[PDB]
Amino acid sequence: SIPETQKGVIFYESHGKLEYKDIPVPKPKANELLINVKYSGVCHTDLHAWHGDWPLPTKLPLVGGHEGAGVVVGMGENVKGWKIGDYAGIKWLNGSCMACEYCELGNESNCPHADLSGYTHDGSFQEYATADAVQAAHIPQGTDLAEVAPVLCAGITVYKALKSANLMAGHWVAISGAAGGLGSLAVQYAKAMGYRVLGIDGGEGKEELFRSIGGEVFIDFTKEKDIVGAVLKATDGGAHGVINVSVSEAAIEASTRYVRANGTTVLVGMPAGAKCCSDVFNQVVKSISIVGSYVGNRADTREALDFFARGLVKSPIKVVGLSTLPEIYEKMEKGQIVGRYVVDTSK
Amino acid sequence: SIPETQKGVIFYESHGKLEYKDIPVPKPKANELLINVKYSGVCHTDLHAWHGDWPLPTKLPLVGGHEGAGVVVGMGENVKGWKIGDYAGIKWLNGSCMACEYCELGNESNCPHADLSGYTHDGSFQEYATADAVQAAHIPQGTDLAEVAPVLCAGITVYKALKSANLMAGHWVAISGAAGGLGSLAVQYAKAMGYRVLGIDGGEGKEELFRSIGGEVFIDFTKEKDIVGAVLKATDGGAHGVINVSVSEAAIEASTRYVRANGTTVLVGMPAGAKCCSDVFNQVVKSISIVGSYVGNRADTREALDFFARGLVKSPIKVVGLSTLPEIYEKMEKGQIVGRYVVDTSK
Amino acid sequence: SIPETQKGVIFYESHGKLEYKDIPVPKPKANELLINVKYSGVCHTDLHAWHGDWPLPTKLPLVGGHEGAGVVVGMGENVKGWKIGDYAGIKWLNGSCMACEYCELGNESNCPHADLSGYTHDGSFQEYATADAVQAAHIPQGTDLAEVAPVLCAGITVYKALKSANLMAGHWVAISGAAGGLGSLAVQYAKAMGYRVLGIDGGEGKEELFRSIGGEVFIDFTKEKDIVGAVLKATDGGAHGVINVSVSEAAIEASTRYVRANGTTVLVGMPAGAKCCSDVFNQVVKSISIVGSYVGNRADTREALDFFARGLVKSPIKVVGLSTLPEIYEKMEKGQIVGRYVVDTSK
Amino acid sequence: SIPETQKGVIFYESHGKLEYKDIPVPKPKANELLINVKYSGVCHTDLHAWHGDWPLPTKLPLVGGHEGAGVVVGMGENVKGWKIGDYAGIKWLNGSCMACEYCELGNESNCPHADLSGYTHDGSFQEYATADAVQAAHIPQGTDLAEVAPVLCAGITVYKALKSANLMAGHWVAISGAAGGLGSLAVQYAKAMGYRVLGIDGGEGKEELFRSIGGEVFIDFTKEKDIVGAVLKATDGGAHGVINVSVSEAAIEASTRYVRANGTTVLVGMPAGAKCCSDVFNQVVKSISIVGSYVGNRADTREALDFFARGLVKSPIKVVGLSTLPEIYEKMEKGQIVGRYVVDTSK
Ligand SMILES: NC(=O)c1ccc[n+]([C@@H]2O[C@H](COP(=O)([O-])OP(=O)(O)OC[C@H]3O[C@@H](n4cnc5c(N)ncnc54)[C@H](O)[C@@H]3O)[C@@H](O)[C@H]2O)c1
Ligand SMILES: NC(=O)c1ccc[n+]([C@@H]2O[C@H](COP(=O)([O-])OP(=O)(O)OC[C@H]3O[C@@H](n4cnc5c(N)ncnc54)[C@H](O)[C@@H]3O)[C@@H](O)[C@H]2O)c1
Ligand SMILES: NC(=O)c1ccc[n+]([C@@H]2O[C@H](COP(=O)([O-])OP(=O)(O)OC[C@H]3O[C@@H](n4cnc5c(N)ncnc54)[C@H](O)[C@@H]3O)[C@@H](O)[C@H]2O)c1
Ligand SMILES: NC(=O)c1ccc[n+]([C@@H]2O[C@H](COP(=O)([O-])OP(=O)(O)OC[C@H]3O[C@@H](n4cnc5c(N)ncnc54)[C@H](O)[C@@H]3O)[C@@H](O)[C@H]2O)c1
Ligand SMILES: [Zn+2]
Ligand SMILES: [Zn+2]
Ligand SMILES: [Zn+2]
Ligand SMILES: [Zn+2]
Ligand SMILES: [Zn+2]
Ligand SMILES: [Zn+2]
Ligand SMILES: [Zn+2]
Ligand SMILES: [Zn+2]
């Protein structure tokens, strides 16, 4: 069954050369399932890990990818509630200690001892990958793993973000970057949660996707000179909560100025060396909160996958081969990425 | 009874010359009480209004002061629940429309039609001042107005701040600037609310005051080279919620780095041209919220004055004459202001 | 313009004889608008006030009706933000003191000095009725007052209820009584807010209405022997939050047993002499909250009318004449009332 | 080291004869620590389990006790973050699946697969007891296990209760039963959390203990004919949140009538066959919530033990021998139990 080797996209140096090579099969640990990753979404976090954009250092050599979805071909001796052949998902947060004050409060992502799939752990860009059994996702039997894969890191993330904005049904939510991997899922989640979804994006075929997936008001950031004025006029005073899934520091800076008094500006995107320089006078006078949202926890994964299972969200995926993966980064560095890309580990 | 003129500190131009002059008695409007301001605290907001540090423009000529406490010598024809001779307080937020979506949610301070005592309305640096009857403070009979006056804008403010940090009893709260007008009241409120109060301040006689009023750990910002390291070591991982009552943009910038994961950094101080340039990567990874807190609303005023009436808080006040007021600004611009100053309108 | 008399349904004794008689025009007070009530919904609260089912005593003689919707033909001298000819709504809570600790926290309905339209104040079953100007509803210009009228007391009520259940999008909400005046609006609001709406009702043509307005799972209380088992099987463990808009004490009693652990059982209906006898062991073991929800406040009115203005909710109204009103009570006492009834004051 | 047998209080039938007998040493499972229980508090839950007062059936034969505190003399092969000789605590909730939707949200106590120490698992009334390694309490090194033991089930319980009442600092909290095992710890926690603690209890030496531990207003339930009137007069309108740690159904019934509008009535005590028959009219009109609170979770255990470690709480313990345990039940059935009793496993 479980082979001796496999294929995988591995790079031995930051910003180096991606190698679609042959790598050994990862033996599962005492509590880590061995999942035959069928499909795996490509997240911009993988591009950041390749470029080395973040202060934390990656593990080298690295096989990226933190949105794996596959079958449990193997399991460690100590795993509790899993069966071989079941569907499971390798999220960004591979595992935690489950014993510090962060994992006790449900904030498992903010843990000092967190294994990050594809950053400090062999990710999901490989045929077989290992992932903890208490943190992996309980993908229901019968789903289409290709469609599920983008939900595992871009779905739970924007779900947790919109839950962190402290919005109510009917409150304007302005997805800043609402045509990308997270922007489109953010729009679908915010539409399913009852909010009124404004969107801010630009490029070729961004407005078409945004309108199709169920947005309300789209504001082109490459054709509107004053974005703040446009959002203040469209939302009648500002968005009640902004989600910054963009990769532009200027977008984040302009995001704290079109949110209402008593609003909330969730920071989800983490561009390279970006600082949210919000004016203190305007932030205090308007009581604007600027929350930061990291990947969702286990309850958030359950609720996001439950939104998916109901058919409310559907990430627009381009399924390609694994070998094409380097070009995707180029297509993602230029910004020409619409929706999400998923890689099939088979090819 | 109500005279024809009075004395007041009035300035006709931003950063101009403060004039302890004779000014007419303000006739109350249809719903505004006429309060004989007995004492009035001096808030740093008055210094900012004098310097013109804020983008919004003041009304000129202006008599500053938004912490007035006095007796209701007169009342408009339409006031509902007030009696002549009762004790009342002129807060910063003079009045609101009580009809927009901000006043309906209790966020009366964030209202487009808000009268700001001492900024867009003749403040409390005068013998008799007028203030709305639904927004003024219900100062209980028997209190000492001299001690109450600093509670009216510096007490409700830090009470609302600590309530905005979403702290629990036992959670470390790091008052950044915990020896000034708001810092000392913030320390007393955070101590009465159950939090463990760390303090960050420096100068002559700041640590003595901080220890006396009930602080736990004091970190001298003029003798600790690495404040972030000191707070991370003292709080064991960071403060669970920071209150930025300081007037240093550098303090605000360093305040987003010693707050725990899932923390909260309430911005209360509004220095001149200050920007909270928090790192986006470190904010998103740690889920750090950066809330801004403006003056408290009517419920917050009630609860802050109720903390005062129990004797839990006591602002260290230096009661001086009104004529001394200009020098106070100097003593406040240099930073040598410890605790709070209150002016007696009589002299 | 404003006439000398008018027609109105007035009863001089509890459970007495309803008299469609001629009554004088109510002169507006200093702050109370005089609204020419065009249409007025008939709420079961009016039936309870007629029967005397509640411990509090009504004012006699009384013209009931607390869901009035009309034009502002007159206004008191002290009203602030109203224009003659504008659309306004007489809600259940006519007015408050706006000065106690309940009105300061936004809980204006829980006020010791609350005027209740149609209970302690001449209600909206009359051509012209008076209602406070800070508490009345800001009905947008262009709406259809006939359709708006049921939203004014049955819409804001169930909106506040579903907001009190502390639900999340995707959480099962079980409207117990989901075909009546409040049940149908509760179903539409819970569907617009993202929840998954289960419904419990029975009779002739209740399931048809429930399916039409957008319910998910309907459980017939006159054809299911074990309602608790049915809800536990349909919701997979119980409803995440129940709304008790029914008028059966048995329904309320059975409502605390099919709500999940960590659930919430909002009590909205107030039957005559009803007691929610929930088992203490089962409530403590499952951490079940039993919240009670009274009419919504001004923010809740704004958000409920904003849900209506978007076209998300639509109360199924039977518009009849005012003279028919007594028979409605019969049609409401027998339980044959489907949706809502509205009376046109003209006829 | 670990012996072959031990002594323990074991009963083979509900309400039968307690046998201080010799029982074998429990071998730890794969993930369960073996704790040499030094001391163990006696909770009224143990009396209920002996009497069979609850619908759920106990495991027979049973050694009760769910407040064990001891040293980790042994550990299973799969335990993660424990060392032999460390201090640990056997709480009521022995362990959970950590995989259902309740354990994911932190509500581990509400789990269908929950091991209850001393109810479905050999409790802490024995020299050596086994308890899961992810759920046991991290008792800091240096504490006095005798004093800690009552915190493990009566401390975390009332801490979670007072956190469930949604109180603010300064809000009156009325501990109903504020001289018993939970009442005294509830008073100390509510005093440390900032609330104003009213107390309701009666008997010999209850008021003395309540005054000593830091209560504010004591209301004798055996000398006040009208408890509701007394609490409404003392709290000025009612308690802002009630904690029902009593064992009287009448106390629970009267507890929903002296809580303010928008209050909260946490149900902590679970008397035999008790029903909280709260009036629906009075509950809906006043928006009174009736929350039920079960044992606290891991975060709640951490925060309660952290309140203890600061020296803020101190359960008044009578340390006795294990053999005396049956008489304690008598002393607890008659109601003559003041504070808490702890048993030393050595004797
Ligand atoms: N916080 C988390 O838990 C988490 C998880 C995964 C990814 N991320 C981060 O999210 C970011 C975005 O990921 P993605 O998959 O959406 O990337 P993407 O490149 O697929 O999409 C980025 C989007 O931003 C839009 N955009 C670019 N400039 C803009 C501007 N000035 N204003 C508005 N929109 C603008 C683009 O048009 C595109 O729609 C990355 O930094 C990624 O690492 C966060
Ligand atoms: N947000 C509101 O509702 C509200 C209301 C009133 C005032 N304010 C603002 O609060 C600010 C402070 O007011 P105040 O009365 O406390 O002023 P103050 O001058 O009396 O006290 C300022 C304090 O900051 C300390 N400080 C200075 N530099 C510091 C640094 N680098 N790090 C830490 N602490 C430092 C000083 O030593 C002093 O203790 C002003 O900008 C004022 O306008 C806010
Ligand atoms: N709390 C508030 O703010 C507020 C405001 C207005 C009205 N109310 C109260 O709401 C209650 C209901 O009002 P309404 O207009 O919906 O009344 P209604 O008579 O129009 O509708 C009652 C509904 O209850 C259903 N029902 C009857 N027995 C049932 C049972 N055993 N199980 C489930 N459903 C059952 C009926 O079939 C019907 O669908 C009244 O007591 C009213 O006074 C509350
Ligand atoms: N919910 C939970 O997580 C949890 C955990 C442990 C125990 N409990 C339950 O808590 C209850 C109480 O436990 P305990 O250790 O405090 O019991 P206890 O017998 O030690 O103390 C009971 C207290 O109730 C007081 N009391 C009696 N009648 C009263 C009345 N009419 N009004 C007010 N006070 C009255 C007594 O005087 C005494 O102070 C038990 O039912 C127990 O099983 C709950
Ligand atoms: Zn990602
Ligand atoms: Zn951890
Ligand atoms: Zn101020
Ligand atoms: Zn306003
Ligand atoms: Zn009604
Ligand atoms: Zn009131
Ligand atoms: Zn117990
Ligand atoms: Zn579980």
Name which of D141, D153, D68, D1 is nearest D343 in CA terms.
D68
Single-letter code of the amino acid located at C32: E
Tell me which chain C residues have a C-beta less than 8 angstroms from the C-beta of A197: none
- Give the C-alpha separation, A146 to B290, whole Å: 37
Sign of the CA dihedral D202, D205, D208, D209?
negative
The answer on whether D340 is annotated among ligand-binding residues is: yes
Sign of the CA dihedral D150, D154, D160, D166?
negative
The residue of chain A nearest to residue B284, with distances taken between CA atoms, is: A292
Query: CB of A268 within 8 A of CB of A291?
Result: no
Tokens of C287: 């951490």
- Give the C-alpha separation, B87 to C15, whole Å: 49
Helices A181-192 & A206-213, crossing angle to 10 degrees? 30
Tell me how far the alpha carbon of residue C274 lies from the centroid of ligand 1, in angstroms: 55
Query: CB of B85 within 8 A of CB of B72?
Result: yes
Tokens of A136: 């992996």
Nearest ligand to the CA atom of A47: 1
Q: Is the distance from the beta carbon of residue D266 to the nearest atom of ligand 4 less than 6 Å?
A: no
Strand partners, A130: A34
Task: Kindly give the residue spans of alpha helices, DSSP state H, lying in D193-266.
Answer: 206-213, 227-235, 249-255
Q: SS3 of B337, please?
A: coil
Query: CB of D294 within 8 A of CB of D66?
Result: no
Query: In ligand 2, which atom is closest to the CA atom of B335?
Result: 19
Query: CB of B53 within 8 A of CB of B133?
Result: no
- Give the C-alpha separation, B17 to B9, whole Å: 10
Contact B303 D163 (CB under 8 A): no
Q: Where are any strands of DSSP class E within B202-333?
A: 217-220, 241-244, 265-267, 275-279, 317-321
Tell me how far the alpha carbon of residue A163 lies from the centroid of ligand 12, in angstroms: 23
- Decide the pairing of beta strands C67-74 and C87-90: antiparallel
Query: CB of A306 within 8 A of CB of A138?
Result: no
Strand partners, B213: none
Strand partners, B132: B32
Tell me how far the alpha carbon of residue A200 lies from the centroid of ligand 7, in angstroms: 37
Nearest to D307 among B170, B192, B303 (CB): B170
Query: CB of C248 within 8 A of CB of C267?
Result: no
From residue A9, give the alpha-carbon distance in Å to each of A16, A334, A335, D318.
12, 21, 22, 66
Is cis: bond before A61, omega within 30 of 0? yes
Q: What residues have CB less than 8 Å from B26, skipping those under 6 apart?
A: B34, B122, B126, B128, B129, B130
Contact D105 A106 (CB under 8 A): yes
Query: CB of C305 within 8 A of CB of C139?
Result: yes
| B129-149: b (≥16 Cβ within 10 Å) or e | bbbbbbbbbbbeeebebbbbb
Please tell me the distance in Å from B201's CA to the nearest CA on chain A: 20
- Give the C-alpha separation, A3 to B5, whole Å: 96
- Give the C-alpha separation, D68 to D92, whole Å: 9
Tokens of B74: 């007169």
| D253-277: b (≥16 Cβ within 10 Å) or e | bbbbbbbbbbbbbbbbbbbeebbbb
Burial class (CB in 10 A: 0-12, 13-18, 19+), D44: buried
- Give the C-alpha separation, A153 to A43, whole Å: 8
Tokens of C283: 């409530």
Query: CB of A170 within 8 A of CB of A193?
Result: no
Name which of A206, A280, A289 is nearest A246 in CA terms.
A206
Q: What is the DSSP letter of A110?
A: G
- Give the C-alpha separation, C183 to C171, whole Å: 18
Chain D residues with at least one Cβ partner in B under 8 Å: 163, 168-170, 192-194, 303, 306-307, 310
H or E segment to which residue D309 belongs: helix D298-309
- Give the C-alpha separation, D215 to A172, whole Å: 47
Nearest ligand to the CA atom of D268: 4
Contact D99 A106 (CB under 8 A): no
Chain B and chain C share a number of CB contacts under 8 A equal to 37
Query: In ligand 4, which atom is closest to the CA atom of D177?
Result: 34
Query: CB of A105 within 8 A of CB of D108?
Result: no
Tell me which chain A residues have a C-beta less than 8 angstroms from the C-beta of C168: 163, 303
Query: What is the SS3 assignment for chain C?
Result: CCCCEEEEEEECCCCCCCEEEEEECCCCCCCEEEEEEEEEEECHHHHHHHHCCCCCCCCCCECCCCEEEEEEEECCCCCCCCCCCCEEEECCEEECCCCCHHHHCCCHHHCCCCEEECCCECCCCECEEEEECCCCECCCCCCCHHHHCCHHHHHHHHHHHHHHCCCCCCCEEEEECCCCHHHHHHHHHHHHCCCEEEEEECCCCHHHHHHHHCCCEEEECCCCCCHHHHHHHHHCCCECEEEECCCCHHHHHHHCCCECCCCEEEECCCCCCCEEEEEHHHHHHHCCEECECCCCCHHHHHHHHHHHHCCCCCCCEEEEECCCHHHHHHHHHCCCCCCEEEEECCC
- Give the C-alpha separation, D113 to D122, whole Å: 16
Sign of the CA dihedral A237, A242, A246, A248?
positive
Q: SS3 of A198, please?
A: strand
Please tell me the distance in Å from A261's CA to the nearest CA on chain C: 15
- Give the C-alpha separation, A175 to A179, whole Å: 9
- Give the C-alpha separation, A176 to A196, whole Å: 14
Tell me which chain C residues have a C-beta less than 8 angstroms from the C-beta of A306: 170
Name which of B120, B119, B152 is nearest B135 in CA terms.
B152
CA-based angle C259:C262:C264, to the nearest 5? 55
Which residue's CA lies nearest to atom 34 of ligand 2? B177
- Give the C-alpha separation, B265 to C21, whole Å: 64
Query: CB of B173 within 8 A of CB of B162?
Result: yes
Tell me which chain D residues have a C-beta less than 8 angstroms from the C-beta of B158: none
B-interface mutation test, from A287, A297, A300, most B Cβ less than 10 A away? A287
Tell me which chain C residues have a C-beta less than 8 angstroms from the C-beta of B98: 80, 98, 134
Strand partners, D68: D40, D90
- Give the C-alpha separation, D155 to D162, whole Å: 11
Strand partners, A259: A239
Q: What is the DSSP letter of B335?
A: T
Q: SS3 of D142, please?
A: coil
Task: Say what the alpha-carbon torsion angle C144, C145, C148, C152 is, to the nearest 10 degrees.
Answer: 160
Query: CB of D36 within 8 A of CB of D28?
Result: no
Task: Kindly give the residue spans of alpha helices, DSSP state H, lying in chain A.
Answer: 44-51, 101-104, 145-148, 156-164, 181-192, 206-213, 227-235, 249-255, 280-286, 298-309, 325-333
Q: What is the DSSP letter of D13?
A: S
From residue A1, give the alpha-carbon distance in Å to each of A5, A73, A74, A128, D94.
12, 8, 10, 12, 39
- Give the C-alpha separation, D157 to D330, whole Å: 23
From residue B279, give the alpha-carbon distance in Å to each of A253, A308, C243.
12, 33, 44
Tell me which chain C residues have a C-beta less than 8 angstroms from the C-beta of A307: 169-170
Nearest to B293 among A249, A273, A287 (CB): A287
- Give the C-alpha separation, A182 to A90, whole Å: 17
Phi, psi of B92 (to 5 degrees): -65, -50
CA-based angle A299:A303:A308, to the nearest 5? 145
Q: Is the distance from the beta carbon of residue A45 to the nearest atom of ligand 1 less than 6 Å?
A: yes
Q: Is the distance from the beta carbon of residue D291 to the nearest atom of ligand 4 less than 6 Å?
A: no
The answer on whether B21 is annotated among ligand-binding residues is: no
From residue C14, give the alpha-carbon distance in Å to each of A246, C59, C166, C325, D2.
64, 10, 38, 16, 78
CA-based angle B65:B7:B38, to the nearest 5? 55
Resolution (A): 2.7
Nearest to B193 among D163, D169, D307 (CB): D169
Name which of C26, C37, C32, C59 is nearest C136 in CA terms.
C32
Nearest to A280 among B262, B276, B279 (CB): B276
Please tell me the distance in Å from A151's CA to the nearest CA on chain D: 19
Q: What residues have CB less than 8 Å from B260, skipping those under 6 apart?
A: B235, B237, B238, B239, B240, B286
- Give the C-alpha separation, A34 to A28, whole Å: 5
With tokens 């009779």, the residue in question is C203
Query: CB of A266 within 8 A of CB of A243?
Result: yes
Name which of B125, B115, B120 is nearest B60 in CA terms.
B120
C-interface mutation test, from D287, D291, D293, most C Cβ less than 10 A away? D287
- Give the C-alpha separation, B72 to B38, whole Å: 10
Nearest to B134 among C98, C106, C299 (CB): C98
A-interface mutation test, from C156, C160, C303, C313, most A Cβ less than 10 A away? C303
Q: What residues have CB less than 8 Å from D172, skipping those under 6 apart?
A: D195, D196, D198, D234, D235, D238, D239, D240, D241
Nearest to C284 among D261, D267, D277 (CB): D267
Tokens of D318: 């009578």
- Give the C-alpha separation, C187 to C192, whole Å: 9
Beta-carbon-side half-sphere exposure of residue B159 (alpha carbons within 13 Å): 26
Query: CB of B316 within 8 A of CB of B340?
Result: yes
Contact B105 A262 (CB under 8 A): yes
With tokens 């006696």, the residue in question is D42
Report the 10 Å Cβ neighbour count for A249: 17
Q: What residues have CB less than 8 Å from D36, skipping those under 6 apart?
A: D70, D71, D72, D73, D127, D128, D345
Query: CB of A92 within 8 A of CB of A300?
Result: no
Q: How far apart are the first and last CA of chain C?
A: 19
Residue D51's region, left for phi above 0, alpha for psi from -120 to 50, else beta, is alpha
- Give the C-alpha separation, A62 to A122, whole Å: 6
Query: CB of B190 within 8 A of CB of B163?
Result: no
From residue C241, give the alpha-carbon distance in Å to each of A183, C166, D181.
30, 8, 33
Name which of A82, A66, A67 is nearest A121 in CA terms.
A66
Q: What is the DSSP letter of B266?
A: E
Name which of B317, B11, B297 is nearest B163 in CA terms.
B297
Q: Is the distance from the beta carbon of residue A243 to the nearest atom of ligand 1 less than 6 Å?
A: no
Single-letter code of the amino acid located at B210: F
Q: Is the distance from the beta carbon of residue D117 to the nearest atom of ligand 4 less than 6 Å?
A: no
Chain A and chain D share a number of CB contacts under 8 A equal to 37
H or E segment to which residue B307 belongs: helix B298-309
The residue of chain B nearest to residue D169, with distances taken between CA atoms, is: B193
Q: What residues have CB less than 8 Å from D47, skipping those under 6 apart?
A: D329, D332, D333
Tokens of B230: 């000191």
Helices B181-192 & B156-164, crossing angle to 10 degrees? 60
- Give the C-alpha separation, D9 to D155, whole Å: 24
How far from the centroid of its chain's Cα atoms is residue A42's Cα? 9
Name which of B275, B253, B247 is nearest B334 in CA terms.
B247
CA-based angle A181:A182:A188, to the nearest 5? 105
CA-based angle B169:B182:B215, to the nearest 5? 45
